[PDB]
Write a protein that binds this ligand. Structure first.
Ligand SMILES: Nc1nc2c(ncn2[C@@H]2O[C@H](COP(=O)(O)OP(=O)(O)NP(=O)(O)O)[C@@H](O)[C@H]2O)c(=O)[nH]1
Ligand SMILES: [Mg+2]
Length: 162
């Protein structure tokens, strides 16, 4: 069946793992557990198509080129309460473009932790950025599960149209 190789990237502690686990195991992980590199394979049906989501959950800690080269689509995540994580996004996109020799790579910008009230990054800020990249912007919360499937499925549809 069709396999979609997705890679979740972004600064440390933004919730890359929490988002993935919610999608796969349907539960919110609320504990300190820094990732080195984990992969999740799940059979799913998206828009009537039977497919295998091969998800690579990466480390935020400063091996990148290797996984960016084989990835078909990327979920670039930042936390809406961490301005630095938002600014780091540029670095990730640039590295992905460089590795894939492409100006356009299936990508989705994800603003996570939208359940928190202490927001420091305005949605409009992220939307403008997303628009300049030419990619979708989706706000999520691994805690409430809002936008989770949305983020992942949109990335799949983006790969389908590339
Ligand atoms: N309130 C709230 N907390 C969240 C959300 N997503 C993740 N967190 C919390 O943020 C912390 C870090 O999440 P984690 O998934 O481990 O982040 P990471 O980006 O995967 N970290 P690392 O890059 O080191 O691997 C955890 O305490 C987790 O519960 C969210 O949507 N809302
Ligand atoms: Mg992690």
């Amino acid at each position: 069946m069709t396999e979609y190789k997705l890679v979740v990237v972004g600064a440390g502690g933004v919730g890359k793992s929490a988002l993935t686990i919610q999608l796969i195991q349907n539960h919110f992980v609320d504990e300190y557990d820094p990732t080195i590199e984990d992969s999740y394979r799940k059979q799913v049906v998206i828009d009537g198509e039977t497919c295998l989501l091969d998800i690579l959950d990466t480390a935020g800690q400063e091996m990148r080129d290797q996984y960016m080269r084989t990835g078909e689509g990327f979920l670039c995540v930042f936390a809406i309460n961490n301005t630095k994580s938002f600014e780091d996004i540029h670095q990730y996109r640039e590295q992905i473009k460089r590795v894939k020799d492409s100006d356009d790579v299936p990508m989705v910008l994800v603003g996570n932790k939208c359940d928190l009230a202490a927001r420091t990054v305005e949605s409009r800020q992220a939307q403008d950025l997303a628009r300049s990249y030419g990619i979708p912007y989706i706000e999520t919360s691994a805690k409430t599960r809002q936008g989770v499937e949305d983020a992942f499925y949109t990335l799949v549809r983006e790969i389908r149209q590339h």
